[PDB]
């Protein structure tokens, strides 16, 4: 027959992002006792030191996917007083744009009760949502 | 006939269900407000 | 159990087993959970589901019921619209 018709019906997709994009990947259900819950594929982590503000998107193994930091010269030279609410909003906007470039659209954010009621991170979340990045990662198919 | 009567009664009782639940909620709110007002009046008369 | 009756000399059966049990043709016996109608307001929903659910009997109780029941109740039964007709037989028993 046609040489191109060979299929090998057991197809192997080596892309690690494949199952996460189809939302059939294995979420890390579990602990329940410790915090935060590690049932996700990507997680937003905001670190607010006394000088700089650093927003990470981390995979469940702990590596850094995309980060937006006030320590970076691009935001440092364009923004004054990198500790403000405006600094958090700018970091959130930059991170949302970088996530759109990276092709990631869903992530989880689990702030503390005193952190979710703050002004800087409320506007950070608002900027992240307005930038196209939506939280509440979709439910796993056949969880 | 029994099936139609059951369906008719179910529809009739469901047509007033929002009104009944709103009335119950308002009654409970009124009772709580009355108890709170009585306690506030007692505290105000006892503090003087 | 009357092993030898007085009138016909046959082997009688106890009516309690047939009243509160069901025998499948595969040899299994069917029974209800004890206490599924007593004090439902005091029990959890999962416990009530377990009480309402049917259960089987092991080898010892199955042999006891077989001894206590006559072979008439061990016959093959073809009822009309029988719910347990699908459970009458056994499949994929690798023993």
């Amino acid at each position: 027959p046609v040489e191109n018709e060979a299929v090998a019906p057991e197809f192997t997709n080596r892309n690690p992002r494949n199952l996460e994009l189809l939302a059939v990947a294995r979420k890390e259900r579990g602990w329940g006792t410790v915090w935060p819950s590690r049932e996700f594929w990507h997680r937003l982590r905001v670190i607010r030191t006394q000088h700089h503000i650093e927003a990470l998107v981390e995979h469940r193994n702990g590596q850094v996917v995309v980060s937006a930091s006030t320590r970076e010269w691009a935001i440092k030279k364009h923004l004054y007083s990198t500790r403000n609410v405006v600094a958090c909003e700018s970091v959130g906007r930059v991170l949302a744009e970088r996530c759109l470039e990276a092709g990631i659209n869903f992530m989880v954010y689990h702030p503390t009760p005193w952190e979710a009621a703050s002004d800087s991170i409320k506007r950070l979340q608002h900027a992240m949502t307005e930038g196209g990045v939506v939280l509440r990662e979709p439910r796993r198919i056949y969880e | 006939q029994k099936r139609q009567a059951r369906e008719q009664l179910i529809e009739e009782c469901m047509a007033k269900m929002p009104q009944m639940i709103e009335n119950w909620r308002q009654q409970q709110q009124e009772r709580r407000e009355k108890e709170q007002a009585d306690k506030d009046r007692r505290a105000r008369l006892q503090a003087e | 159990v009357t092993y030898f009756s007085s009138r016909k000399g046959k082997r009688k059966t106890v009516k309690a087993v047939i009243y509160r049990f069901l025998r499948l043709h595969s040899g299994l016996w069917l029974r209800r959970k004890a206490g599924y109608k007593k004090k439902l307001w005091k029990k959890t929903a999962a416990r009530k589901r377990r009480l309402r659910e049917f259960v089987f009997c092991n080898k010892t109780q199955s042999k006891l019921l077989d001894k206590m029941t006559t072979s008439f109740w061990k016959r093959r039964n073809w009822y009309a619209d029988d719910p347990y007709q699908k459970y009458q037989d056994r499949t994929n028993l690798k023993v």
Binding site: - | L9, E11, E12, C13, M14, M17, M20 | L40, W41
Partner: protein
């Protein structure tokens, strides 16, 4: 302080009853329960007293 066992039926027209423990010195019982016949959040009111 003695409790009371009260049987409450649905207000959705369908016949659906369930039992609840209550305090004797309280008012008539009225709650929002779940009715599986209509599969809805239904107001349930007290009608009968079963056990003390």
């Amino acid at each position: 302080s003695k409790t009371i066992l009260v049987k409450m039926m649905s207000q959705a027209g369908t016949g659906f009853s369930f039992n609840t423990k209550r305090s004797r010195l309280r008012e008539k019982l009225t709650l929002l329960h779940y009715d599986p016949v209509v599969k809805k959040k239904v107001l349930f009111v007290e009608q009968k007293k079963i056990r003390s």
